[PDB]
Amino acid sequence: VSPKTRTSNLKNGLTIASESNPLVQTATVGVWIDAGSRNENAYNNGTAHFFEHLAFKGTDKRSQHQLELDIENMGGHLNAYTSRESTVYYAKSFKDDVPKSVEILADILQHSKLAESAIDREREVITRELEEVNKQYEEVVFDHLHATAFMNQPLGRTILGPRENIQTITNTELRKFITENYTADRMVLVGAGAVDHDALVELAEKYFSHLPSSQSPVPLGTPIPNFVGSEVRLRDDTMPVAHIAIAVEGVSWTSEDYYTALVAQAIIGNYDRAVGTSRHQGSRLSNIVSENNLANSFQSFSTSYSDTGLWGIYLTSENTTQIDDLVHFTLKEWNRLSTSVSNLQVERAKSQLKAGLLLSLDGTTYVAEDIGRQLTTLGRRVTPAEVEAKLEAVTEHDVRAWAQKTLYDKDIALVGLGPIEGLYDYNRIRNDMSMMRW
Amino acid sequence: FSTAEAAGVKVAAQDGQSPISDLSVVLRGGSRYATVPGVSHILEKFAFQNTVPKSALRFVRELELFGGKLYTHTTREHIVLRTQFLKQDLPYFVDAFANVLKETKFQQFELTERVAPVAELDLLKRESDPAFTALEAAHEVAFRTGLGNSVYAQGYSPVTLEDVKEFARQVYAKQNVAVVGNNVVPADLQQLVGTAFADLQEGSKVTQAGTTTLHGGEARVRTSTGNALTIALPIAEPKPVYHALASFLGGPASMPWSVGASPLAQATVGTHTSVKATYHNYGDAGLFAITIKGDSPAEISQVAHKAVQALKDTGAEVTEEQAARAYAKSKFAAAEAFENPDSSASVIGMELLSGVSRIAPENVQKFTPAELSEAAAQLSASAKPVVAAVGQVHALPFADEL
Amino acid sequence: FSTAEAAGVKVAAQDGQSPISDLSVVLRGGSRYATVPGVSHILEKFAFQNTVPKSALRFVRELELFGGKLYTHTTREHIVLRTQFLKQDLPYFVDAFANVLKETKFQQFELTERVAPVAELDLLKRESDPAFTALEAAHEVAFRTGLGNSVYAQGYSPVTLEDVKEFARQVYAKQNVAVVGNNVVPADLQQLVGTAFADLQEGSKVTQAGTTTLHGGEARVRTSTGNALTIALPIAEPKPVYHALASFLGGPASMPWSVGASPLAQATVGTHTSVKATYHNYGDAGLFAITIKGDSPAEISQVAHKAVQALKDTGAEVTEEQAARAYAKSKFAAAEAFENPDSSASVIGMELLSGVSRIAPENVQKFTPAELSEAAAQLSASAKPVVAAVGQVHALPFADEL
Amino acid sequence: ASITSVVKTSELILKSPLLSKIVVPLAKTYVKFSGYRQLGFKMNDLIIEETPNMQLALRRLPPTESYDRVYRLIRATQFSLSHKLATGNDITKPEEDDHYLIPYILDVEAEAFEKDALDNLEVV
Amino acid sequence: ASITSVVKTSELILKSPLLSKIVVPLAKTYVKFSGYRQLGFKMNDLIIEETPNMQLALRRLPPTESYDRVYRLIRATQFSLSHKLATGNDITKPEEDDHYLIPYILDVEAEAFEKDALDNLEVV
């Protein structure tokens, strides 16, 4: 039984949430923000990512060089990432270096220079990032997947933004973005590891007390997405490996089917030929794929957002004449979530998940990420007892009922990259979303 | 970690407040003890294959019912087999390790179809990073055998089933086995290990064939898949100051989208190259390495010159600020290593299998600017510099140029 | 061979009494002058491809009607293109060489489909012998660039059509071309070269980018395809005594089913290994090598120790008999080299292009036992020994062991 | 007919002033009414490719020319199935209608025809 | 039937003293009249091989056993087409009739059957 997550508020509405571990000597403190690329419009798309670069480019006090030195002297490191719905800025340090790290984070968030000279310098760095993501095939695939599934909607935009915006982002629009979005009621200060909650609340009162509150404070993790069944083909015959993602509209964080979708995802599961145990996994798809050498890997996913999600699978394969078989067998395993699954598969997946959801949290950064994600999506940290109860409530009837309304005979979004000549057209893929025998 | 003994086996455990336990068997069976090249990698990959009580298939299916996970790796010193599971499932995992050490059926088909192909993919994935290759090449030049043996199984020298079975006969013995339990009640683990590992052979301590000898030289691994360069300096007397020096010289940034304030980090400005100084203590010898990877051989060459200069400059004078920055970066590195389960297990494993007491992160020594500059001076004035170049080797520096 | 000049091109010919003539164009374009690794090999393989007057196809079909043959090779110093034909067909062959030097269409499809695949098979055939690989590796360690460039094109460094076309623009010029005619009437050849090569560019002498620098070291080439070891010693002042020393130390047997009476041959007794000492003069530097191949790495190691001892023993004392044996074996080696058309062409080619007057086999100097022992003494006590091991490299010797 | 034949006959016509004066204007109208440019094709994209000689010529195209040809074929196929014509920049302008393939096929055929001749040589 | 089945039932018989006393002599006569030894076969050479399990067992044979099996099949095929029987050393003697393949197929089948069982497990 893990220690209790303590939670306090300030007057402005900043949440402080902490989970102490007296067995470790490091601590991860940081700020989780319920804001991301989705908060931009089409004209300033890319701003949130642009800001993340400038946050480390110097503040009103410390210059770029002083900032570097201050963190070097702390001994740990700082890290940040911007997603579609969430921004994180954290600092991993030693136990007694926590007041330094909180102070630096408070500085870079509230008091950043955003000097025209630095805007102009990063404008090239970010322009170069546009031509080098091209190599990270999984990210290429998932960014096209969002672009097509949520065609012309805010979730469909990339985080980097178009080349055109990168050239026209001003310090004005950067400042406007962080003034509108980085408000106290949307922020959580999180500490995990060797942190005292009461110490962290004092540091919050010292550094984050003059944060703006929004005019209309909605609860944390408050949002209409209209999924488009569609496909993007990025054929490249010179690549040896095909990367394919197939997804349907999935579930939001607060859906009543959130756990049912996780159990269904666990019934299909993951596979990787390079891992020794993967040839012996219980999943039917795993057995088909491994016995027939259909793929190097596959990974089931169930991504959630505040008001929608994508549920599906990501496949990689060198077997370019049997891509059809790989896709066929994958979608026939999905069909069986509607037609055939019983207590046998459901209870096995629940067993595997009850541990999996706890196992994931194995370091201070993972714990901090879990507290931060849960607080900014659900408004609370859900105790393992509650999670165990929600998983236990999933029956085989729930899985079949969910699959029949979410997967069965539904439109898919499909992205293929690489040697995908063998991937059939949209209709033949989408026809595998049902079984004529049922 | 309360160190004890259960039926001749050294057991160290630390209770915690988490639902998740990590149990690791650390074996004195890393590559420095490898009878034939690659055997310690193969033996690692042969863990949790078919045993007499339980098939590999049955083990994996039951592990999924517990939602446990399995992690294995080989170092120059150890083979580490780790399981991660829920606290309550401890007895199952203890018995599983017992079956592996006592009753593994080393079958030829498992070697040909399961173990060797997985070993080969493991290595190919590691080599995708040219910096990995460069640092491996550097150890091979510096030590030749023992520490200079390859960690991984390679194609040019095949490991046979008789090789692996012989090595396992030596390694899988009470004298070469340590059990390390994170978030495991220490009294409960001692009771279980004491019943499960009672019939394990006693065996003898595995030893390195021959003494560690240091050599200088050059390795020129011509690849087409990226460029890297290691500058290593073999150390005959491993001293803890080299940790402080590695962290001082640094190389990686402590901040996104930054270069860093470390001397080696500042050596990369204007280049798309990265750099990392590392120190490897192996008890009886050590290796201080500076690895530079990049897409341009011209830029790598440029950074390599600045890197050697940085080390010479350090040998001249360190400031008090810089010495304190080294203490801070080094204490932090020690702390995170004792937290990470992979490295944690091997640290206590070394304490249990040898007798080298762990240096707790809170007890990491502060080195004065005098002590740091002295350490850097010895390295700049080494009689046996090693340089391993990987990639377009015709365009990378040579030892005599540096 | 009567040296003359015909329209700015150096022509050497020697009339004889045989129906078969050998015409060879020797180009100053070997690998030491290469701009890009492998271009001199590629340019050699691009000879007699499509020219503007005559396609490769038409050339081969017509060559078969004359029953002529075509031989090409690349050295570190030259590209040699030789034709062998009936005496009377001389004008056709002169004109064919003129078309190649003036009018070769270097087409991308020829490079991809014809030239590069043939270059690759050429290299694979040579490398089947591990001794070839070992001696190539040794030059690479000893000289790094220039003489240390690879002779042959390799996959890792792709030669482009622009590379080859640029190099050909330099090499195919009056200043880098010598014509050598064996059993060709010298007056007739001068007349024909003077009309056919008149419109060839004058160009400039191709030069080695940078001076020849000597280095010591080790190369360790892992193959699964047999074992060899070269022990080379770079020579800063090439002297003719090293020929005598190479022939003295010997290595190959001078009669069937025997071992031989040479010090290196006697080092192989009880082993299935062979040995050969060689000396390579390159004008401004040289290389003295001893190559040992065999199927057993243990036996190679054994012979390598005896080989180094033999050289040290030579530095001590050689008898009068042994010095005379060295004169005899060396005169013979010189004579047969001047006879073989392959080596003959390059010998006069070096006299014509470079200016190094040939040493006639009858004028090969007799070295006293004093002079031989002094030469061997200077080699055993070299500051820069090179060792290239090929095969099971973990089991072959290192430089510091020798 | 071989490309070689077509090219040689065309060159005979272009040489003769009279002939060119009457043939070139006709050929330009023919090409306008042909209408392949309205599907974004270049003339050489239409040449039959299912022959050994043409497959060899296509393999010798530089990679960029080859990738662009693939795109024009796919784009024209999509206009064909949709019953639409190109508009704007998809229409091939006369200055873009370059004979990118003709030099490759003429070289392939030159060798093929020389081989046929030389297979029939008679030592005199 | 599976080799597993055959082997298990045979072991039940060999255990029972009564049963073995009456079955073993019959089985030895059966084998003598069967006459596969007169074509130089070993019993295991006759087992049906066109099955995934059997193809996998055959791939796991040591190279020597595999090369010898190939020769016995070729030799038996030549006796069959010639209508001759083995003589001399080509006749399989009872001590040479070893079950070289049985251990491989029993291991392949053990895994195959365990996989089937475990595909039907029910968490309790």
UniProtKB/TrEMBL annotation, chain A:
BP-aspect Gene Ontology terms: protein processing involved in protein targeting to mitochondrion
Cell compartment(s), UniProt: Mitochondrion
Keyword terms: Hydrolase, Metal-binding, Metalloprotease, Mitochondrion, Protease, Transit peptide, Zinc
Matches recorded under InterPro entries: Metalloenz_LuxS/M16, MPP/UQCRC_Complex, Pept_M16_N, Peptidase_M16_C
Catalytic activity, as annotated: Release of N-terminal transit peptides from precursor proteins imported into the mitochondrion, typically with Arg in position P2
Pfam assignment, any one: Peptidase_M16_C
GO cellular component, one term: mitochondrion
UniProt domain Peptidase M16 N-terminal: residue ranges: 16-163
Ranges for domain Peptidase M16 C-terminal: 169-353
The protein's Enzyme Commission number: 3.4.24.64
Major location category of this protein: mitochondrion
Cofactor or coenzyme needed: Zn(2+)
EC supergroup of this enzyme: hydrolase
Function: Catalytic subunit of the essential mitochondrial processing protease (MPP), which cleaves the mitochondrial sequence off newly imported precursors proteins. Preferentially, cleaves after an arginine at position P2.
Family, per entry: Belongs to the peptidase M16 family.
Protein name as it appears in the record: mitochondrial processing peptidase
